[PDB]
Amino acid sequence: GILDFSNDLDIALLDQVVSTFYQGSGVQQKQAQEILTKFQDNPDAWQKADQILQFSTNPQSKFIALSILDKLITRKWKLLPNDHRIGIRNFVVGMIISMCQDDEVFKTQKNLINKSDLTLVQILKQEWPQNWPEFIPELIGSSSSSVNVCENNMIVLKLLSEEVFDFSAEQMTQAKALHLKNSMSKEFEQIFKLCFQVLEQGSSSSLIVATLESLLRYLHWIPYRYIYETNILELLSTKFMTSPDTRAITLKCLTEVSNLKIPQDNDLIKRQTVLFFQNTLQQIATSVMPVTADLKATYANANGNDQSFLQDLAMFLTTYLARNRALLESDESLRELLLNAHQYLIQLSKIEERELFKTTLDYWHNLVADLFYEPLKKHIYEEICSQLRLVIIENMVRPEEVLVVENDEGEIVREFVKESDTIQLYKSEREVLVYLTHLNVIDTEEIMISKLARQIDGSEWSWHNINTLSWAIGSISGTMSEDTEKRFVVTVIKDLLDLTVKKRGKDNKAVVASDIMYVVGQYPRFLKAHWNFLRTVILKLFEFMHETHEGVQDMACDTFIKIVQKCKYHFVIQQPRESEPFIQTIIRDIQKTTADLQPQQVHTFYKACGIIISEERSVAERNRLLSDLMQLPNMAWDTIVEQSTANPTLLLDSETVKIIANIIKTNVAVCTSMGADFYPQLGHIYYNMLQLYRAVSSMISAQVAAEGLIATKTPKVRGLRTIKKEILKLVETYISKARNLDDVVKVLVEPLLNAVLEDYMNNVPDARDAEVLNCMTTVVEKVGHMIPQGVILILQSVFECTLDMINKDFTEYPEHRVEFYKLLKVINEKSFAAFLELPPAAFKLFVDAICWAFKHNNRDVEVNGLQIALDLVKNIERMGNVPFANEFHKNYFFIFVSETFFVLTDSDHKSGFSKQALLLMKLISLVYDNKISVPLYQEAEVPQGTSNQVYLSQYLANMLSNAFPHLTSEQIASFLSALTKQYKDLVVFKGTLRDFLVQIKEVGGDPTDYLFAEDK
Amino acid sequence: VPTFKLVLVGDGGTGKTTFVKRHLTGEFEKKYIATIGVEVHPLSFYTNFGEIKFDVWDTAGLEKFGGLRDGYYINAQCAIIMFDVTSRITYKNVPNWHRDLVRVCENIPIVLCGNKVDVKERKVKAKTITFHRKKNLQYYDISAKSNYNFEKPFLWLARKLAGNPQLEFVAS
Amino acid sequence: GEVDDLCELMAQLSIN
């Protein structure tokens, strides 16, 4: 056995278990893991920690012992007598010293040392300075005893600063956090002395680096006087920048220095600010590299430390310049320095590392915005700007990206990525280059024409180069005057066409052509001003739609729909020179045009045509265009509805299911583009489509009932589910975009509900689609205020059965959980009357369902659950001293209070905190604002006429005492007093709750802490 | 073939387990089955320079299932801090994971990953994610559902750990 | 002329 959960402890065996877990593999390592976890979670395990720390031959065992000690210190420290406390404290200091005296251990086991130090810092939080007032003097004194102890002292101080200033919120009560911050500020003169002495006398070494590490953390909070009124600025900016081993951490320190709270009307501080920066830059120039250094090549061939350094350099410059560019600009002697620093960024901007480039680009954006709005200083940075232009043009990223995903039905679907890192980078670059173009149009144009010419002669020809250049050219769209834009676009397109003729290979031609289309798609103004060109492009795209070359068809469809999105008006109007709106021409030949396209590309083409059609404002002509467009799918739909009605077996034919899917998908596409305008088409296929839905759903449910869950994965059921989902998607799409709500209510709602609600109830769980709930959510969102009986039917159909699906655990049917509470929420918003009419038992189930959502370790469910609770309480508040409200309070007020507290005080429900607090405030408000007009108690259990305030207080005190017996009466009383005094202030209330949440995790918390807000 | 320990940390439901599972099997799990303690998954990648193995220590991001917590991090050679771009609090806690991690592992390559970038309603915007800058962490937008930048974290970690920027991932 | 000539060139755009 490797079980060490007995009475006597085997240190060797524990080492064995630890070694099995850390160096072992597989099932053994698994068991070892569970064992170690069980041992580590023993309330009494700390009693063994010291023994381990003294006897274990395993560094990891010591680490785990320190973890157990950490638990004891954080949670049950104040249970121990003062004697024992001091004992453990001196045990840890002594152990730390022992480890430091061991040079091997000190250098090779930083992890164990850091754990030790952190354990000490935990003891400091709990003890210092009230019970350990001599700690900082003793620590500084001991610094001389060993170099390792000196270094470790710097680690301990760094850790203490982190715990007190960096990570104190949400780990400590506001009162205790203030106490520790004040304690650490009081004794910082001494700490800074030790620090400065080490920095001033010491030379580059591990101890110096550790000292600077600590200084980095100090800089977050220390007064600027320790930086500006001492010689530390000179030390950092000169001494520690020359020594390689300290450059990076010194830069980090100077980065934070750049961000200090300093006086804004002190000329000496201004000169000091300039001076350290001038020193740092000159020192980098002298010791590291000049402005002329090729940082791109350097970074590429660098060793990671050098890379980090270069990153840190950019962080330094970008921080300092963003704060102090004005300072560097005002005095013309500083000109050479200013430009030099910017030059570094330029060089740093050339480094191929996205995150570093983004860091530089934020600043670049700042600078070019400032120059745009203050063109007086523009000339100073003319040269810098010119180079920046080239940088950005050379480093344009893809403006839009596409993913090919497989959905739950097994379909291969092309989706456009939205709001990605790359897209935000594109947008940032675009804004920077737009600014740059505004600043000097002539320079931007010259650069772009040069890159293009270098593309033509083949000197800089590559797919990536031409793509980048194209993206760049497209990015500055709408910046030049239409005349200048006209000449520019003409040149670019002409050159690119000549390039295409010159390039050999289908690959190369495709690349350049796709670039041509991207560029033209990026300049809608040029297309609108020149119809002939627009037509030529559209036809050329149609021509491309028959090209089998990989990617070309998608390019053509993407360009087409992109161009129409912007230029729709020019398709619906008769452009003289044309005998008919070009939309008619497109619709005429749609069969021929889209013959070679993939299904999804066809759908995109229809979507495009829909965009165009919705531009026609005459209802008659628009409806005709829509009809003409939908003719092919309409006709196949007619022939299919006839055969299906007559022969149900057709839905067994996979070819039919395909055709049906494509028909509904085409409807979805056109409905997407056309919105309310699509209603005629929807009406054309509606009732039949709902029937087909009922059929496909019945078939899915039957087969799943018969075969089990596996059936849901079969190609047959997958195809059928596609049809089901597409139908639901069409309906949701139209209703979401609908304008004429009467027609929705009176024509669409009733058939839809009849079709899908009863089907959903009667489906087997494994066949129910959450999309049904989603569709219902959208219906309720849009017209729920108009369909009270419809909403009631939705509840009656989905509530009990979906609940019963998802109330077994937190894991089964996740999509169902999400959409169920989204629907409950929207119903509660739009048609709360429905919940009013439910029988008492049904309403109880509702409340149970809300509280069920509370307990979910799922953000999607949890937030909706809390929102429902809030909204419900708001809804019932709207009703006055009405028996329903009174009864609801009598039945559920305390349920809601207790459930909210349960999820507040639960370890793992932090996402809902913001909402939880609100709900709690509201509930408390209802009692402390005297807005509940009936006693919330019973039996006269509290004497007649007892105020609901006193009863709420009693209930809360009792409940919290039961839940948390380790809190004192004084703790609970004070917390409740604070809550009941602070229910009108959200931020203070949240503070008080966080204080309580800190205090329930520990024993012997200070009841005064709840007066924190009242104190300030 | 070299084997490197990869500690995967992040808040609960940020998509760490699903990420590893899809790397292993190719399947995307829809359910949220919270990790308890740690699961160690040997994950292999094939490259033009050979096979590279990762002992992925998929750690529980829930407080109640934390287990050994930072204990899991010892001897890690690389790390992924994952958050969920649809949940602000998961990014809020990124500093806390980073803090826990580097206090055990001083100088290791770390990738910060914004998962679930597929969701339409993205709460943690790209421009907001800057924490990795000062901590010299790699960052990637990823999606375990979408297979978006799916291999990029591991590609970066492999390049760092091998010291070879020319390393490319290849088929078996 | 120049736009019209662009149209002609655009029309002739080929991937072969």
Ligand SMILES: Nc1nc2c(ncn2[C@@H]2O[C@H](COP(=O)(O)OP(=O)(O)OP(=O)(O)O)[C@@H](O)[C@H]2O)c(=O)[nH]1
């Ligand atoms: N939209 C979207 N959802 C995802 C993605 N990856 C995972 N999810 C879902 O989010 C949840 C995350 O679950 P896991 O990955 O097992 O959990 P974890 O992140 O390890 O959390 P713990 O085990 O509690 O630490 C699952 O329910 C997934 O289906 C993704 O890329 N996109």
Ligand SMILES: [Mg+2]
């Ligand atoms: Mg997990």
